[PDB]
Every structure is written in C-alpha cells, then in structure tokens.
Design an enzyme around this catalytic site. Structure first.
Site, PDB file in Angstrom:
ATOM      1  N   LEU A 278      77.562  38.217  35.620  1.00 11.37           N
ATOM      2  CA  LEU A 278      78.809  37.531  35.898  1.00 11.37           C
ATOM      3  C   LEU A 278      78.746  36.861  37.270  1.00 11.37           C
ATOM      4  O   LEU A 278      77.871  37.138  38.095  1.00 11.37           O
ATOM      5  CB  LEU A 278      79.994  38.494  35.837  1.00 11.37           C
ATOM      6  CG  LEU A 278      80.273  39.354  37.067  1.00 11.37           C
ATOM      7  CD1 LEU A 278      81.706  39.822  37.013  1.00 11.37           C
ATOM      8  CD2 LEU A 278      79.344  40.542  37.155  1.00 11.37           C
ATOM      9  N   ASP A 279      79.699  35.972  37.512  1.00 10.30           N
ATOM     10  CA  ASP A 279      79.625  35.078  38.652  1.00 10.30           C
ATOM     11  C   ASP A 279      80.257  35.687  39.896  1.00 10.30           C
ATOM     12  O   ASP A 279      80.895  36.740  39.860  1.00 10.30           O
ATOM     13  CB  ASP A 279      80.291  33.752  38.314  1.00 10.30           C
ATOM     14  CG  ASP A 279      79.525  32.983  37.275  1.00 10.30           C
ATOM     15  OD1 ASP A 279      78.292  33.171  37.199  1.00 10.30           O
ATOM     16  OD2 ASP A 279      80.144  32.197  36.535  1.00 10.30           O
ATOM     17  N   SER A 280      80.067  34.980  41.013  1.00  6.51           N
ATOM     18  CA  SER A 280      80.607  35.397  42.300  1.00  6.51           C
ATOM     19  C   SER A 280      82.123  35.434  42.281  1.00  6.51           C
ATOM     20  O   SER A 280      82.734  36.267  42.961  1.00  6.51           O
ATOM     21  CB  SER A 280      80.140  34.430  43.382  1.00  6.51           C
ATOM     22  OG  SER A 280      80.703  33.145  43.154  1.00  6.51           O
ATOM     23  N   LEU A 281      82.730  34.544  41.500  1.00  4.30           N
ATOM     24  CA  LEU A 281      84.178  34.428  41.447  1.00  4.30           C
ATOM     25  C   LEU A 281      84.797  35.710  40.900  1.00  4.30           C
ATOM     26  O   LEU A 281      85.640  36.346  41.548  1.00  4.30           O
ATOM     27  CB  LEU A 281      84.530  33.221  40.579  1.00  4.30           C
ATOM     28  CG  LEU A 281      85.855  32.465  40.651  1.00  4.30           C
ATOM     29  CD1 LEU A 281      87.043  33.232  40.071  1.00  4.30           C
ATOM     30  CD2 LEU A 281      86.109  32.035  42.075  1.00  4.30           C
TER      31      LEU A 281
ATOM     32  N   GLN B  90      83.259  38.464  40.604  1.00  5.09           N
ATOM     33  CA  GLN B  90      82.828  39.511  41.524  1.00  5.09           C
ATOM     34  C   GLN B  90      83.873  39.753  42.605  1.00  5.09           C
ATOM     35  O   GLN B  90      84.198  40.901  42.937  1.00  5.09           O
ATOM     36  CB  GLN B  90      81.473  39.108  42.112  1.00  5.09           C
ATOM     37  CG  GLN B  90      80.731  40.119  42.948  1.00  5.09           C
ATOM     38  CD  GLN B  90      81.102  40.057  44.401  1.00  5.09           C
ATOM     39  OE1 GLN B  90      81.426  41.068  45.016  1.00  5.09           O
ATOM     40  NE2 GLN B  90      81.059  38.863  44.964  1.00  5.09           N
TER      41      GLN B  90
END
Lengths: 89, 176, 128, 87, 73
Positions: D41-44, D46
C-alpha cells in the site's frame, strides 16, 4: 560550472516539447522519440524546482538622450492581460 | 529545520499538509460520519492529480493548496492533550527530577533503599568502565573533517554500549 | 480567494506561504547544507562535554556569556553622539519630565489659589 | 487514571486496528511486515494508519517519525518509547 | 493485564449513518472508506442514544407518581 548548473536545472524532460509538422505519421514520431528520448531526465538536483513568479509592471520612463542619431525611437507600453483570458484576443 | 537532512522534501511537505488538513477537518467536523465522508472527499481531491510526471505544476498546486488550506483552517485546531501547544505540555513536570540527584542523599536514606543504590553504583561503573576508549574513539574515528550530520553510529564493534547514551537512557518516566 | 496575508511586526509569517521557499536555487541548498553542518558540530562539542561522567560543573556556554557582555558592558564603548542618538535622548529623557513638571505646576497653582479664596471643601481635611 | 499497558497488549491493540482496516487481508498480516514491500500500500494510506494510531492512543507522533515507521513492529516500539512500557 | 480482545469481523458495520454515507459516497463513486471501525460507536449499549428533549422529559417517570400522591395529600 554555472553552464553545467543551467544545463542541469533547465534541460529537463517534463517541461519540454518535441513536435513535428509535415507529411509523417504519429506512430513513427512516437517510436523514434521512444528510441532516442528514453533517457534524458526527470528529476531535479535535490528538488531545486524553478517556479514562476507573477511580477509587477512599474510604469516609468527611461530616456536616452543621444542627439547624434538621425531618427528617434519611442516605445510606449502598458500592462499585459496574460494568456488564458479572452481579453488577449 | 530537522536533524536528518537539510530540508524535508517535496513528498513529506505534501504529506505534512495532508496530515494538517485532515486534523483540521477533525477539528472543524464533529459527529464523525460527515467527518469520514469529507475525509474520503479530501483523499479523492489529492487523487485527482497524484500522477503528474510534471513537477513544477505540482509544486504550484502545492502552493495554491496551502492558500486554500490556510484560508480554511480552524481557530482551535484539535491539539492532543499530550502535545506542546496542547493542554499538557509537560504537565507532570513537577516530578521530572533528573538523576544526577539521589546520590547527594544522606546515608541514612542510602540505608533505607539499599539494593537500588548498589545496582545504581554498578550502573555508574558500567558507564565509566566504557567511557573513555570505545566512546571517544568511536566519536573521533568515523566522520569527515566536519561532522555534517546529527545522527551517530551504534556500537556494532563487539560488545558494550552505544556512545553518548546516558542522558538518553536516564530520563523521567513521563508519568510519575 | 484570499488577500495573501499581509504581515506585521507581530504576526509572524508562517512556514508555508513564504513564497521564497519554492524558489530553491542551488544557493539555498548550499546554505541549508552548511547550516546543518554548523548545528552538527556544535551539538557534537556540546554532547561530548555534556556526557562526561567526571564533569562536575556546568558546561559554561560562550554564547550566553557573549550575549551578556555585548548587552551591558559593550554599550558605552562603542558610541558616537549622532543626530539620531542626541535627538532621541533629549526627546525620551527630557520630554516627559518637563511635561509632568508643567502639569504639576498647573494643578498646584489651581489648588493654592483656590484655597487662598477659601472656598474649598476642607471643612474637615485634617489628614493632610 | 492508569491502566498498565504491556507489550503483548499493545501488540494486540495495534494489530486489531490494522486488521480492521479495509484493503489489507487478515491472511498476510504479519508483525514483521512492511507497508512498502509486501502489503504494497501507498504512503498516503500509510499516514492514514499513523493517523489511526494517534487517534486511538491519544497523542501525536511527529513527522520526523511518520516518514520512517513503515512496519508494525516499529510502531509498537515507538509507542513503547512514548509510554515507557514497564509496570 | 488481561483484556480478552473483543474481536474483529463482528462489527460488520451496518450502522445507519455510516452505511448511508457509504451509500452517498457510492453514488459519488469513491467507495473507499476507512471502514468498520466505529461500529463500537454505533451499536452495543449505544445506537439511538436518546434525543435531547428525552433527557429533559426524563423526570416524571418516578415524578408524576409522587406528584399525584402529594396532590392526594
């Protein structure tokens, strides 16, 4: 060194345009750009991104009196409207 | 203004904006359901142009985002009651006594708590036993003619303690 | 959508809308690198002379000493009597004094003349 | 106002709120996982996770750290730092 | 030190403002919320916590009985 800095900071991939006009198809141009422009750039030197500043129009006069000339040049100017507004047209 | 590097980056700058706007949207929005709605709306608004290969239009959109954020913040952003700015801000600092004290006690009370002071004394001998050689050699050993960083390496050499650890380990327990 | 946040001598300009932070030239990268280097070396000297187990006294900052000696003892040298210094000196030193002087003359001459008439309310004014 | 936190308990509460999160699975949900490698999953989202931990336990974590947690074990370690978890 | 962990896949959200706002955001075409978190806020001994004039009109349950008895006094 300053030349290399300017070359590094402004000859970047996303801002620039390759465009052709004539008797040639888009597939040929896309493939040749794929075979040559794959590998120029895309990332800045630690994100030193050049960014526009909408500046200010002063309004003044500079007059260069130099009488040993045959004719005289005058330029008079006012504000520019911009681009996307239809006042341009 | 940060210990790791000289700047945040573009990425973490946008990220801190997203954290702040989501937090302010908490502070604006009670009842938690319309909160959840508007949070997904805000995430979609960042999803619209996440994938710009451009960079300069991205950072210009960052600046215009900061304008519409700072126009739309809250008078009381919801700060947690543990944070600076918040309601606590070292609230129970009344008892956050540093531990260079407690050795300047009269030996009647050093007789009142005996085992603790024995083990504390072998702690101080642990400190001084590995203070000179390993710690100061590891500090004057590795870096450049200027240090130019605020991290420090661990004691991966063989055995004992990482350097400069005493006022990191021996701190108050944050609720006494 | 917003009148772009005119600053003041009180309202600090926040971190976000500078807008100088987005014109990162290489000089700002150079300056931030050297500024981090200065902070690194000072925390190194401080931390090594902070964690010495033999160090009994205080760490004796030259920054605080330098500020104090600049603030008090390094005023009178140096100085020259300028127009601005002399002007502001005679203004903020003599102005209020001479103003308060004339107004207490005025109040006192009122009260002296008025009780010289005798028509003051000192029917019982013993605690003078 | 002090119920004692403990290491097994904080592990269970953090993994409970990760498991409740939508777009992960309860199968490939490990303690030694990654928010970058294997959950992918992405940094967002996260930082949505970081928001979940801050809003559950009641305290901010600063953005010097939210760059660099990226796994549940270091989350548990960092609330172990903020809380100083022994009885 | 025990807690016994009242567990997941039990919430199953369905709590009517969250379900209907996932309906409205479904018609919006996003369909990606945070999820089944707040059902412990939307059921249990919760779930139609009473409306506001109910707390004010709460009084006369034992109240009118005592009032009619004192009327009879």
């Amino acid at each position: 060194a300053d030349l290399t800095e300017y070359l590094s900071r402004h000859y970047k991939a996303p801002r620039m345009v390759l465009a052709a006009a004539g008797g040639l198809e888009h597939r040929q141009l896309l493939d040749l750009a794929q075979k040559h422009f794959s590998g120029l750039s895309g990332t800045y030197d630690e994100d030193a991104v050049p960014t526009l500043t909408p500046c200010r129009f002063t309004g003044s006069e500079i007059r260069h009196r130099e009488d040993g000339l045959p004719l005289a040049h005058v330029a008079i100017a006012v504000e520019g409207p911009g681009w996307a507004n239809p006042d341009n047209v | 203004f940060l210990p790791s590097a000289a700047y945040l980056t573009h990425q973490q700058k946008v990220l801190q904006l997203y954290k702040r706007a989501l937090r302010h949207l908490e502070s604006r929005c009670v009842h938690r359901d319309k909160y959840r709605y508007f949070a997904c709306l805000l995430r979609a608004r960042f999803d619209e142009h996440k994938n710009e290969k451009d960079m300069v239009k991205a950072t210009q959109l960052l600046r215009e985002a900061e304008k519409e954020f700072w126009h739309g913040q809250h008078p009381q952003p919801y700060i947690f009651p543990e944070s600076p700015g918040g309601t606590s801000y070292e609230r129970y600092e009344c008892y956050k006594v540093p531990e260079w004290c407690l050795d300047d006690w009269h030996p009647s009370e050093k007789a009142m708590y005996p085992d603790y002071f024995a083990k504390r004394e072998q702690w101080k001998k642990l400190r001084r036993e590995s203070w000179e050689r390993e710690v100061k050699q590891l500090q004057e050993e590795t870096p450049v003619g200027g240090p130019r960083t605020e991290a420090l390496p661990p004691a991966r050499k063989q055995g004992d303690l990482p350097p400069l650890w005493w006022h990191i380990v021996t701190r108050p327990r944050e609720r006494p | 959508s917003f009148p772009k946040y005119e600053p003041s001598r009180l309202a600090s300009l926040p971190t976000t809308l500078d807008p100088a932070e987005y014109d990162i030239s290489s000089e700002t990268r150079k300056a931030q690198a050297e500024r981090l280097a200065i902070r690194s070396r000072l925390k190194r000297e401080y931390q090594l002379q902070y964690n010495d187990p033999s160090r009994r006294g205080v760490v004796e900052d030259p920054a605080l000493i330098r500020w104090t000696c600049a603030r008090s003892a390094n005023v009178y040298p140096n100085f020259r009597p300028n127009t601005k210094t002399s002007l502001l000196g005679a203004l903020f030193g003599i102005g209020p004094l001479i103003f308060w002087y004339y107004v207490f003359k005025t109040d006192r001459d009122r009260k002296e003349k008025l009780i010289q008439e005798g028509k003051l309310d000192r029917t019982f004014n013993i605690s003078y | 106002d002090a119920p004692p936190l403990t290491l097994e308990g904080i592990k269970d509460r953090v993994l409970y709120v990760l498991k409740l999160y939508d777009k992960i699975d309860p199968e490939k949900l490990s303690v030694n996982s990654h928010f970058m490698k294997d959950l992918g999953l992405d940094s967002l989202d996260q930082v949505e996770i970081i928001m979940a931990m801050e809003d559950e336990f009641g305290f901010e974590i600063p953005d010097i750290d939210a760059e660099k947690l990226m796994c549940p074990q270091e989350i548990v370690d960092y609330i172990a730092d903020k809380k100083d978890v022994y009885e | 030190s025990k807690m016994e962990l009242p567990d997941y896949k039990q919430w199953k959200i369905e709590g009517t403002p969250l379900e209907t706002v996932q309906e409205k955001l479904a018609a919006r075409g996003l369909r990606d919320p945070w999820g089944r978190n707040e059902a412990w806020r939307y059921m249990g001994g919760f779930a139609n916590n009473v409306s506001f004039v109910g707390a004010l009109l709460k009084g006369f349950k034992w109240g009118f009985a005592a009032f009619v008895v004192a009327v009879g006094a």
